[PDB]
Ligand binder design. Structure first.
Ligand code: 9TE
Ligand code: GLU
Ligand code: GLU
Ligand code: ZN
Ligand code: ZN
Ligand code: ZN
Ligand code: ZN
Ligand code: ZN
Ligand code: ZN
Ligand code: ZN
Ligand code: ZN
Ligand code: ZN
Lengths: 261, 259
């Protein structure tokens, strides 16, 4: 009893969560729009709770600091009791599954390569066998951890280069990585999840593209604190929304119906 | 320590009898993707296991009258097996009665045709009658069409449920054989994983057409509340991140390709 408003942590990442044009004249959840905003409303309706969308303070997805062992990002918000649920493009990983709970995945993705159109790169192998074109990943994300922990020859070779490249090839936000690709005249390639790659490919000035296949296969899941009673209902809601076609409808809405290319 | 009873199903390339199975015993009789996966799961979770083929040869559905589950799902629900390692699709109705690990393989419903059949999509199938089409019985694909309100898929279900003779088959092998002997007058709706495998096997006379109708995955299943669920789930995530699952897929789908 005593129903409480569910605190939802999320992250400003297009097209998942974006500020509306007139957000300063709106209140509460009405300030935001996007895929995860639509998904949050549906999860809440089917689970029967009220909620409040909050943007993660440090703007990070979630990683454990090697020195302090403290989790940052949305994962930290769940681990340390600042939020009840995370509805965001948060990647299911083993290290995260040990400290938080994930629903079954609501979106599939893989690590992919973003290039400026015309860049002579077709695969991760191509990137690893050359030096003219620099490449990097997002900081404090699952893509960086993938390369740091990989024992696969090609990916290990890529990590050896990235960790020691100077100036740093890592970026603080996805928008920073895309801008770097666009302004580097083809001398920077960005490693990011296929979902964000495919979205940017459909946005003006339509000068980037996804090349090659995905480097791995994984999914985004809705996250709750370990043992939270909310996890069960949220998981069943994700499965219901997928089977009813809602997740496919939302992706088409925010990726391709709004495409500008 | 108890030997874990694993329920599975004879379905290529997931679980197959070895060519020399007759002179082998126990788990050594079988080979395939899920046989390799079971060995890895058991290794990382630290248990011994016995592979057993589901008695009724079904994946799992609930009888509308008696409400009794059949197939591998029933074996878990009624205590005859400790874990199911098979191409078992994660679905809402199943998640209510059994536990699933995070998915170890992705797939979608797809269309298998005899090469040359004038069909390009599910929409094409729905707007005609010359070419019959159906699904596997007691599986998640049949439930998908039964429970779907999407116009095209609802229209397809109305035809399939009333089609005479029955368009449903008892096994995937029966559906594939029906496509191959129909001279292009039967199309089979099945999961993309099995479709893509058959496409690369002799006599190389079928193909997958169109995109997938949905997006879902296979999970390792355990009885609700089973102590194995936690370790199995972490094992799947570790095997994926290590690249083992991608290695096994290439081993059994495309390294085995004969077309
Ligand atoms: C290691 O192999 C992997 C990794 C990651 C996902 C996967 O297979 C999927 C893909 C999608 C998917 C499911 C399972 S599900 O059935 O868990 N939920 C419904 N969704 C769709 C809404 C996205 C297989
Ligand atoms: N989705 C990733 C962030 C983006 C990336 O790492 O490429 C995560 O959950 O950490
Ligand atoms: N993988 C399906 C069986 C095959 C199908 O229905 O197409 C299931 O778990 O029911
Ligand atoms: Zn709804
Ligand atoms: Zn090359
Ligand atoms: Zn493309
Ligand atoms: Zn191993
Ligand atoms: Zn292990
Ligand atoms: Zn009956
Ligand atoms: Zn039947
Ligand atoms: Zn209907
Ligand atoms: Zn094809």
């Amino acid at each position: 009893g005593a129903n409480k408003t569910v605190v939802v942590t999320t992250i400003l990442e297009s097209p998942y969560v974006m500020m509306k044009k007139n957000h300063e004249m709106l209140e509460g959840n009405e300030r935001y729009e996007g895929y995860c905003v639509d998904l949050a409303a549906e999860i809440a309706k089917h689970c029967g709770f009220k909620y409040k969308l909050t943007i993660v303070g440090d703007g990070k997805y979630g990683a454990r600091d090697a020195d302090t062992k403290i989790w940052n990002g949305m994962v930290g918000e769940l681990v340390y009791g600042k939020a009840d649920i995370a509805i965001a493009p948060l990647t299911i990983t083993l290290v995260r599954e040990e400290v938080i709970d994930f629903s079954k995945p609501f979106m599939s993705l893989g690590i992919s390569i973003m290039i400026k159109k015309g860049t002579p790169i077709e695969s991760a192998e191509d990137l690893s066998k050359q030096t003219e074109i620099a490449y990097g990943t997002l900081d404090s994300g699952s893509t960086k951890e993938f390369f740091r922990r990989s024992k696969i020859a090609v990916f290990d070779k890529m990590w050896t280069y990235m960790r020691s490249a100077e100036p740093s090839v890592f970026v603080r936000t996805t928008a920073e990585g895309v801008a770097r690709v666009r302004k580097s005249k083809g001398k920077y390639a960005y490693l990011l999840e296929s979902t964000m790659n495919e979205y940017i490919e459909q946005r003006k000035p339509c000068d980037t593209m996804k090349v090659g296949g995905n480097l791995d296969s994984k999914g985004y899941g809705i996250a709750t604190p370990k043992g939270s009673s909310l996890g069960n209902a949220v998981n069943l809601a994700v499965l219901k929304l997928n089977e009813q076609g809602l997740l496919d409808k939302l992706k088409n809405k925010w990726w391709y119906d709004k495409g500008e290319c």
